[PDB]
């Protein structure tokens, strides 16, 4: 069964720099990792805005084909709505897409893997790991 949801920041970081430290974690936890459809939208955007969309898109599609992509459903949206209010009423900012990724994981009990721990630590009830 799945265990980790990779954040958008760690995906870009991995796609760009392909670091061996993250390669170890990927080989070790292969099959237990997923991304939010929100993250898929961001990297497809990163590809389409490049000077070589089809090329960069093709390395995106190879990365995605190795992980499950989870649809952002009513459960994810519900938890995200909670998180937006839980953060608002404590004044701690988190970016809009990161809120949606946060709620998707919490809705399923998944561990967020991110290199931006300072923001995701602002979300209540969510487990964070840094694989970078």
């Amino acid at each position: 069964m799945l265990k980790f949801m990779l954040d958008t920041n760690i995906c870009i970081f991995t796609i760009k720099n392909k670091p061996a430290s993250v390669r170890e974690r990927f080989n070790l936890n292969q099959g237990r990792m997923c991304i939010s459809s929100v993250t898929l939208m961001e990297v497809i955007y990163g590809a389409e805005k490049s000077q070589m969309p089809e090329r960069n898109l093709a390395v995106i599609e190879g990365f995605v084909s190795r992980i499950d992509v989870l649809d952002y459903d009513a459960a994810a949206a519900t938890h995200t709505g909670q998180i937006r209010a839980e953060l608002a009423l404590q004044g701690r900012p988190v970016g809009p897409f990161d809120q949606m990724i946060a709620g998707h994981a919490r809705s399923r009990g998944l561990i967020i893997v991110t290199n931006n721990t300072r923001e995701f630590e602002r979300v209540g009830g969510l487990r964070i790991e840094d694989w970078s």
């Binding site: 958008t8 000077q51 990365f63 970016g95």
Partner: protein, 69 residues
């Protein structure tokens, strides 16, 4: 898990997977590996080292993430 049976198809010998054991429909190719009297079928090209050693992205893939803030 689920049981099944073997057939004699496309002039060879194949076997079905009911939905309970069916693969993701995006798996177009598979590796078949022989262990004892048992066969192991896995999605072809799934390994991470293959993608980590392969084609890179161009350098312009992030001028910013463009998350509003």
């Amino acid at each position: 898990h689920m049981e099944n049976t073997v057939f004699l198809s496309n002039r060879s010998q194949p076997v079905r997977r009911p939905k309970a054991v069916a693969l993701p429909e995006n798996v177009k190719r598979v590796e078949v590996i022989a262990v004892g009297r048992t066969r192991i079928i896995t999605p072809a090209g799934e390994t991470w080292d293959e993608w980590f050693d392969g084609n890179s992205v161009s350098a312009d893939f992030m001028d910013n993430r463009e998350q509003p803030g």
